[PDB]
C-alpha cells in the first residue's frame, strides 16, 4: 500500500519535516512574520506536490489493475493452454476452421 510511492522517499518525508521544524530551536536557542510566511508557503506548496505525486502514482497503478474466454487465451501467450492428446477435444481444435480456435 505504501509502494504507490517509492520507500526511498518516506525517509525524505521526515528529513524536510525535521529541517523546517528545527527553526523553532533557532528562534529560541542557537520584518513581520515573513521568515515563516515564506517557509510555510513553500513547504505547503511542496507537500501539496507529494500528495498529487502520490494520488496520480496511485491512480496510475489502480487504472492499470483494471485492465486484466477462449479469445482471452487465444490473443495472448503467457498462459499455456492445451488438451488431452488424441481425444475429441484435441481433434476439435485440429480440425476447426474458425479463426480463433485455429489460432489456438
Amino acid at each position: 500500500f505504501l509502494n504507490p510511492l517509492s520507500p526511498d522517499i518516506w525517509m525524505y518525508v521526515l528529513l524536510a519535516c525535521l529541517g523546517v521544524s528545527c527553526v523553532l530551536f533557532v528562534i529560541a536557542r542557537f520584518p513581520k512574520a515573513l521568515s515563516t510566511r515564506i517557509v510555510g508557503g513553500i513547504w505547503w506548496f511542496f507537500t501539496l506536490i507529494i500528495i498529487s505525486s502520490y494520488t496520480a502514482n496511485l491512480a496510475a497503478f489502480l487504472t492499470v489493475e483494471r485492465m486484466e474466454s477462449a479469445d482471452d487465451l487465444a490473443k495472448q501467450t503467457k498462459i499455456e493452454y492445451g488438451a488431452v492428446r488424441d481425444g475429441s477435444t484435441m481433434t476439435f481444435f485440429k480440425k476447426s476452421k474458425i479463426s480463433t480456435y485455429e489460432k489456438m
Binding site: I9, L34, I38, I42, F46
Partner: peptide, 22 residues
Amino acid sequence: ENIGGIFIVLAAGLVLSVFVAI
C-alpha cells in the same frame, strides 16, 4: 527521478529563510 525534481525547490526555501533576518 521526477520524485526528486522538487526536493531542490524544497531545499530552495530552506536557505531563503536563513538570510531574512540575520
